[PDB]
Amino acid sequence: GKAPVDPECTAKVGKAHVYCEGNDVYDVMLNQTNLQFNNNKYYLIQLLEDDAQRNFSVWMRWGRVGKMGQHSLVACSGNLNKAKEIFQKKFLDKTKNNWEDREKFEKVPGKYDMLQMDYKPESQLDLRVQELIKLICNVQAMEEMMMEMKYNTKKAPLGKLTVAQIKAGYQSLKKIEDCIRAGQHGRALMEACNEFYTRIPHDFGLRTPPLIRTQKELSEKIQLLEALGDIEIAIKLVKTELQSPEHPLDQHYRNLHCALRPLDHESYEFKVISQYLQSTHAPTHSDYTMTLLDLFEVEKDGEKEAFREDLHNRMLLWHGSRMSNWVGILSHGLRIAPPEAPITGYMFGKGIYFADMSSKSANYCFASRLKNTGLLLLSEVALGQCNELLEANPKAEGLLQGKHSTKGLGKMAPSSAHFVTLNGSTVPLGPASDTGILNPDGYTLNYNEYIVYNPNQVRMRYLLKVQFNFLQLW
DNA sequence: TGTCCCCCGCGTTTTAACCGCCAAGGGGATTACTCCCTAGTCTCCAGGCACGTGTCAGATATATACATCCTGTGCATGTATTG
């Protein structure tokens, strides 16, 4: 794709380009880590030829990942052959792999590993959908969030990654899961951790990179990788388009390929949805309120044929996520976790996750005081017969045996006596009350949650535009 | 308490003090005298002292402008370790 030049080479950012030849783009990033000996270092290499004058150069820059480091610019006055030689020689020295056949890369212990990078207007639409698309399709905000994913929360310091790089990361998490499952904290565990930290760049400052020892860190790493994938899909979706759009967002909307229609505030549907939002605000999430500003009808192509209409127990359940990634869902729908992803990160397995209490799912929006706009999606989910779970058991999926979804039994939850109906789907109104489920052996889940596995059992139905209103801070 | 060097103990080498004596004459030491300077006298008056007197230099706040002490603080730097 679009090949960017490292901006840090100020002497060449505007007069020079990264070299390419078909497949082979002479740009590469290497990472190494060995917690046994506490190495965690990167090495970027880029061949740049000037645009204006015929002159090639090799740029190298190295240091601890996150902390910018020592750089070198070697000019050649157009000696492309020597420069390419130097490039390949250094690549081999640092990797033990030849550069030209980069396709068949094999990392070796005690050497750097490679990684893979991404380097007449009649705007006819309802004004409300226009505001929605402009909100979610704001490329500036996506860039700013990506920059925050490097300098605010150091999860991806050096840059972005590819889908396949994420898949290799998942492979390493699988190896970590296998290792940890046997509770052995010796040498193999340290090497597996080395492989993880090699594939996904982290910045530990100086404190020896710690061993991944419990399930919580596994799941956190998994969520980090998921956020990486989300950013990747969001930037893939926001690709701009030409051909007389007179409002490029209309093509972006086609890319959503999902009808989203404005609803009137006085319609039964709007009022009932507001009732459901308000009645189900958990009392233990009282640091903020939420107001329903607007509500949009959802019609996603292909989902109708897939819905398990035959299955009973159909209810409308929440799903929250940050303002930016929603563009992906509306174009592709919700997906089960990556198969290559370790099962043991999900205390009750993979699949699609929903709540019936607005604030619990709403916590996954990460709205802010400065940025007070968030979205909650409502979907009709045919749960069918639920399997009842008292205590965490990541293996819930084997226990289904004919059931179609899992229920995690929370202390606080609405009782079916208050349930209402919307278009023949069950709407589980609150308030939450005690459910008389308790555990005389272990802990008790704070709140119920429902998980489905077949993607065909979800049908998105309305998208909620929500003002999160925070309060006094001191 | 520790250091180290400088002063002590001692035998040695060199020098001039000391011892014994002599000799020259400058000046100390003696004598006599004489005159002028001071003692002695007396007189006279103004310098100098006791007593008054007034003011301004200095004594007494008084407020003021530093100058000083004292403590705390933030920081460029010495060390650690890595690419």
UniProtKB/Swiss-Prot annotation:
Residues annotated as catalytic: E449
Intracellular or extracellular location(s): Nucleus; Chromosome
Catalytic reaction annotation: NAD(+) + (ADP-D-ribosyl)n-acceptor = nicotinamide + (ADP-D-ribosyl)n+1-acceptor + H(+); L-seryl-[protein] + NAD(+) = O-(ADP-D-ribosyl)-L-seryl-[protein] + nicotinamide + H(+); L-aspartyl-[protein] + NAD(+) = 4-O-(ADP-D-ribosyl)-L-aspartyl-[protein] + nicotinamide; L-glutamyl-[protein] + NAD(+) = 5-O-(ADP-D-ribosyl)-L-glutamyl-[protein] + nicotinamide
Consequence the record notes for mutating E449A: Abolished poly [ADP-ribose] polymerase activity without affecting localization to DNA damage sites
Record annotation: effect of changing H319A: Abolished trapping at DNA damage sites upon binding to PARP inhibitors (PARPi)
Post-translational modification: Auto poly-ADP-ribosylated on serine residues, leading to dissociation of the PARP2-HPF1 complex from chromatin. Poly-ADP-ribosylated by PARP1.
Expression tissues: Widely expressed, mainly in actively dividing tissues. The highest levels are in the brain, heart, pancreas, skeletal muscle and testis; also detected in kidney, liver, lung, placenta, ovary and spleen; levels are low in leukocytes, colon, small intestine, prostate and thymus.
Keywords: Acetylation, ADP-ribosylation, Allosteric enzyme, Chromosome, DNA damage, DNA repair, DNA-binding, Glycosyltransferase, NAD, Nucleotidyltransferase, Nucleus, Phosphoprotein, Transferase
Record-annotated site: Cleavage: D118, Y119
Effect noted on mutating R64A: Abolished formation of a complex with core nucleosome and HPF1, leading to abolished ability to catalyze serine ADP-ribosylation of histones. Abolished DNA-induced ADP-ribosyltransferase activity
Record domain WGR: where: 15-112
Summary of subunit composition and partner proteins: Component of a base excision repair (BER) complex, containing at least XRCC1, PARP1, POLB and LRIG3. Homo- and heterodimer with PARP1. Interacts (via the PARP catalytic domain) with HPF1. Interacts with core nucleosomes.
The record's note on its domains: The N-terminal region (NTR) recognizes and binds poly-ADP-ribose chains produced by PARP1, leading to its recruitment to DNA damage sites. The N-terminal disordered region does not act as a key DNA-binding domain. The WGR and PARP catalytic domains function together to recruit PARP2 to sites of DNA breaks. The N-terminal disordered region is only required for activation on specific types of DNA damage.
Protein name per its UniProtKB record: Poly [ADP-ribose] polymerase 2
Organism: Homo sapiens
Lineage: Eukaryota, Metazoa, Chordata, Craniata, Vertebrata
Gene assigned in the entry: PARP2
Residue numbers of the full-length protein present here: 90 to 583 of 583
